[PDB]
Design an enzyme around this catalytic site. Structure first.
Site, PDB file in Angstrom:
ATOM      1  N   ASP D  14       0.797  -1.219   0.000  1.00 15.51           N
ATOM      2  CA  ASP D  14       0.000   0.000   0.000  1.00 15.51           C
ATOM      3  C   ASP D  14       0.834   1.275   0.000  1.00 15.51           C
ATOM      4  OD1 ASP D  14      -2.434  -1.312  -0.233  1.00 15.51           O
ATOM      5  OD2 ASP D  14      -2.710  -1.450   1.951  1.00 15.51           O
ATOM      6  N   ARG D  96       3.343   6.817  17.846  1.00 15.33           N
ATOM      7  CA  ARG D  96       3.071   7.738  16.753  1.00 15.33           C
ATOM      8  C   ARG D  96       3.890   9.029  16.768  1.00 15.33           C
ATOM      9  NH1 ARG D  96       2.199   3.412  14.762  1.00 15.33           N
ATOM     10  NH2 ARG D  96       0.204   2.939  13.712  1.00 15.33           N
ATOM     11  N   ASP D 125      -5.159   7.263  13.364  1.00 16.19           N
ATOM     12  CA  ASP D 125      -3.739   7.392  13.067  1.00 16.19           C
ATOM     13  C   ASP D 125      -3.365   8.628  12.257  1.00 16.19           C
ATOM     14  OD1 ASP D 125      -2.480   5.493  14.610  1.00 16.19           O
ATOM     15  OD2 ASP D 125      -2.456   3.926  13.071  1.00 16.19           O
ATOM     16  N   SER D 170      -5.138  -7.164  11.007  1.00 14.81           N
ATOM     17  CA  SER D 170      -4.580  -5.827  10.871  1.00 14.81           C
ATOM     18  C   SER D 170      -3.790  -5.534  12.146  1.00 14.81           C
ATOM     19  CB  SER D 170      -5.707  -4.803  10.680  1.00 14.81           C
ATOM     20  OG  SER D 170      -5.207  -3.478  10.560  1.00 14.81           O
TER      21      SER D 170
END
Lengths: 385, 385, 385, 385
Positions: D14, D96, D125, D170
């Site tokens: 991706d 993050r 996210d 995932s």
């Protein structure tokens, strides 16, 4: 057994009686400590009263703590916009820890094994003093004669004075405020008499001409007034005179005490009332929204800590670290108009730190859509209002 | 696709333009809703303007919501002493949810599948309206033409008006406040011009004679003024007139918006400024200390909820339940003196609920000893201040 | 002077000594009160011990309070996910107010002018009891012999017993927990001995086969276990047996006491440990986000109130009103797997109240843009990270 | 217009598609950034994939950030005992900001005017990344192709890949946790399948022999394990292996997202689950009570800030300053026994900072008397419970 005591000494009759009681009951050397924190009392006569009462010269301590009071106690508290129960600017509470700490240090310095004070045996003040003492010298013996002695008559108090050889209100004064209690104030349903207020003009006697002032701030603290850079005491004093002149800063409340129940008092906080208004205005253009709001949320807790006597505590240091971090970019100038009790903000600006300084309507649509999601989910789940 | 819309209609030029745009772009029946919440505008001409613009009589809704505004929105908020950023009494924010809810209900009642409003596409107001709509009717289509249409020129806006056939400040008025923005106010370093203030006398023009007033409270809400029991709108109106007369309630701030950044505005909150002071005084003799302090701690969060448009939310209902529970015994009377911008408390009393109404000095000794334990343990562990 | 006292009576040696001391020192009629709250002690012998010690039959009160304990004290606290210092489930603290209130009411009912208890003169427990007493009967004389008598030797305590005619750990047991203190536990650097734990299997002795259980909730409270609707005590007991069987709920902490400093204790909370996990899972699908988060923020304050003995206070009632309001839609079912000390959530569902049940990426763009505004304004103002 | 973009590049399909889309749609030079934060992926092949896709060597950035992750992000958060909604240890949220900041700095260093990422256009996210970017480089253009492109079919996504030339869940993995979503987890009423858990043994497969470990702390941070002083990543890795070995750290929740509604996920936090328990035990003997309690009160707010993506914000820095100040004396050692999912504290000690280390029963009497005053005043005022 006790050999040497540091006494908070004002020269007044009651602490003079306490001084003699210490020498006799504990059979010790008394050290006197008198501090200037804006009381507006000459310090010298206290030395002389102490001498006539048998204190050694070298055991007489007279200290000016005005600058330090404003710098390390008053300004730090105002960073938080601290106000107790939405009204009280904590004038008594903030001054206490400065006195208790200084007294504890004189004790350490002189080799004194005890400290003492003339605070009431049933008021807030004894707590404030003793928490402070034990922050700096936790081994100190604490002597509270009001709690200890058998001298609980007025007649048995006058007799003792004899044997060992002004405003009618009970007042506490410092650079931040003047406090009044007693007399007619005892009834909270009764208005105060006009002649009680000793510091500030009433708004009725205040001038018919408003006055503009400009206050400069650096990291959340006042640093200049009308371009004039003064010492911290210098700055607060100037604001006091301005506040007094224009009848600013009067307050009439019953408050909840830490020790005991509710109490009715009046307060004159001329400079501090102006300080708070200006400090909010400063923050309004220089502080990030969430930083300001977070400090607002934590303010009452901070105010209660101060009120209750917990200035020198881990909690308060934690809260201060948070508060101070919020203040880093709190640099700028506020303009105010003073008129008969009113502190009106008329301008605020900042040279390098104003956040007043792209997004469109489609952006706002998406912000709304995502905040409204929970309401739509709820509505579908039967939880319509 | 949309068949029938309820529009918040004021009769002004912009919402008249919006009304025509709805009929044409969405090709629907428009329902108008005009509410009296203290704007001081005649309601009738809005009906007539709506008629001349093609609205059916039965689709014209004119409602007086003054009493309900004060009763179910204003008084409940004041129980918390809600103030945003230490200054703002939330006059715009508190009024919004009343309008959005009423609009949502007219929509439901008429069978309308959409609602609409003339709020700015980049201001706080669009958020307040839409959160409210979705609380009561989460299936409603929401049309915000300011965010939707291609009519973003003034010239392309005037052209549209033609094709489909006072104070210079941007103002919001209701029973609680009047808001001012725009013009000189745009520069936060610039003072407002005196002729901007439309509601209240300035403290300079306010009378030289002070006025005493007595305010009765029941469960935290105002119920009487000088012995006079009025309707909720009646009460707030009376306080407004008193505040205006004496130049009370003016405010000059920059505030943090929910949507966008900082904004400078002026506000006249004559009645509410008096209400807050009195409500604190009431609580001071009638509320338990910790109950009052707990509510103080949670006030800013509550104020932000109101400001941001979250009146109709689970959070706020939770906070209200807490707030209201604090108010059960908040019954009594407060006495205040008004003079040129000043709201001075001069008395508070309560017939059955005052806590102002044994312990001795030895008891206080033990209270101090146990609070000081952690300081002594800490001191012995090297953590002396 | 005192005529008639209600004593918290367990039948143990120390409260039997206290019973005789009351009769002699205060020269009064003693009323005994023994309560079942899950101690696992037969109630009958207490009546007989009381009779042999001179108590009148009619002054012997034996009450089963198990259901009421869980219903009006335990379940209400768990709505908040109350946990003290991130570990302690408040088993002792929550039980105290039930006992003190019931004792106060027996006092009122019998016409007794005093109450009394055998709690330590320097522990948390005396505070919990007395705050409770004064909530229900503020005129009651309070007699704490541990604080009052001259019987502070063991030898002078044995002598008194004579003159007036199990696990080695200091334990507190009820339907919520068993507490252990003393012996090796005194050193917080020392591990507990295995034979101390009297209620729950160790995870090592717990079965090698996991067990699934289903818990039904109504308005935040447990109502059924594996489809079985039991009385509140019934429900907590069932969870206890499940927890004990699988070695769940053990805890080893030092905690901060309200009165005094730090204390090391071990706790068995088998049922409550399971309850907390399940209650979180319930809320996770049934509570609005901000409602859940608001309750989380206020939980520690609530936990400290309970711990310190302030169950019956205005604060706590305010917090409860908030807490309870959050629970209205807390209806549903949670599935858990128990295995050797582990409480694993494996499923949660709700028949009518799940919020687990449109917006797009362009909508999210606008949500981001508006939250990021302050960061862009700040960045331009030199405040880059 | 855009000339040069820094892309968060994993080498996956991706982000490889995104890399080609950037080069073509914005017609720019792409810079790749791949970071090791404990994913357990070889970094090298990403460089090679990037080369085969047309990236210049000098525009390929491969960085090991494991030590810095634990040191400046993980350990600082654990000082607060941060846990989201009482369960979630924030493994995704805390990682993050490290990535976004590093990406922003590579952008600055390379002269890149834009950054980009492959985060979902409707998940948490994207927010986390963009808030971070703008903290460090507020002028950066932000490109979120998931929100921007017309490539919203799988077929139209496969076609694009062609034209420009493992576990089924995932997952998000780092040194703190592994996250699982999707598949059976989609139904929160359905249990996870056993073969999903990739990192930790189940408690059923964990050894029958418990293991003792000793953890040393300095100022609130882990510094040694069984006497072994490791690098921060070294320490967390060791705890991970211990946790995995004994089946510790598994979690099954639905959580409230910042963006969107509720989501069901499973998490493996072996090392962090042990860290939290030990850190509480450390604080229990080394922290002042009120300091610990104050931090508890502010923890959820802090946890939400982290969760929502506000690590680099003024709020969080304020809260951190408070948190860190609480940690100054948090030096000592904790002993724990690990067994099949259980983290049991069995000992805690401190060489110089333990507060576990006079007052009598008469002192406690006075402490009680003064706390009970408000209850007696209230009782006399009709407010008996």
């Amino acid at each position: 057994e006790v050999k040497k005591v540091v006494l908070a000494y004002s020269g007044g009759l009651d602490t003079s009686i306490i001084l003699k009681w210490l020498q006799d009951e504990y059979n010790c050397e008394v050290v006197t400590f008198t501090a200037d924190i804006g009381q507006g009392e000459e310090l010298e006569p206290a030395r002389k009263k102490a001498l006539s009462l048998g204190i050694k010269e070298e055991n007489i301590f007279i200290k000016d703590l005005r600058d330090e009071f404003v710098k390390d106690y008053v300004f730090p508290m105002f960073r938080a916009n601290a106000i107790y129960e939405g009204e009280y600017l904590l004038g008594t509470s903030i001054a206490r820890p400065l006195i208790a700490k200084t007294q504890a240090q004189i004790a350490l310095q002189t080799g004194a094994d005890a400290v003492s004070h003339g605070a009431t045996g049933k008021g807030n003040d004894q707590v404030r003093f003793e928490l402070g003492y034990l922050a700096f010298s936790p081994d100190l013996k604490i002597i509270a004669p009001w709690r200890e002695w058998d001298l609980n008559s007025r007649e048995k108090l006058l007799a003792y004075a004899q044997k060992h050889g002004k405003s009618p209100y009970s007042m506490d004064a410092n650079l931040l405020h003047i406090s009044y209690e007693g007399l007619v104030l005892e009834d909270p349903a009764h208005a105060p008499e006009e002649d009680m207020w000793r510091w500030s003009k009433s708004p009725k006697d205040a001038p018919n001409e408003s006055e503009i002032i400009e206050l400069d701030f650096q990291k959340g603290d006042l640093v200049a007034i009308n371009g004039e850079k003064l010492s911290p005491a210098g700055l607060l004093t100037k604001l006091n005179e301005l506040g007094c002149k224009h009848g600013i800063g009067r307050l009439d409340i019953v408050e909840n005490r830490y020790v005991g129940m509710k109490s009715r008092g009046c307060y004159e906080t001329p400079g501090g009332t102006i300080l708070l208004k200006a400090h909010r205005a400063l923050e309004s253009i220089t502080l990030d929204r969430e930083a300001a709001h977070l400090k607002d949320e934590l303010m009452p807790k901070y105010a209660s800590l101060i009120y209750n006597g917990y200035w020198f505590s881990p909690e308060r240091m934690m809260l201060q670290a948070l508060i101070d971090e919020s203040q880093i970019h709190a640099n700028g100038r506020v303009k105010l108009e003073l008129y008969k009790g009113n502190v009106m903000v008329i301008g605020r600006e900042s040279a390098n730190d104003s956040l007043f300084n792209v997004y469109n309507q489609k952006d706002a649509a998406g912000f709304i859509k995502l905040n409204a999601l929970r309401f739509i989910i709820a509505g579908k789940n039967g939880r319509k209002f």
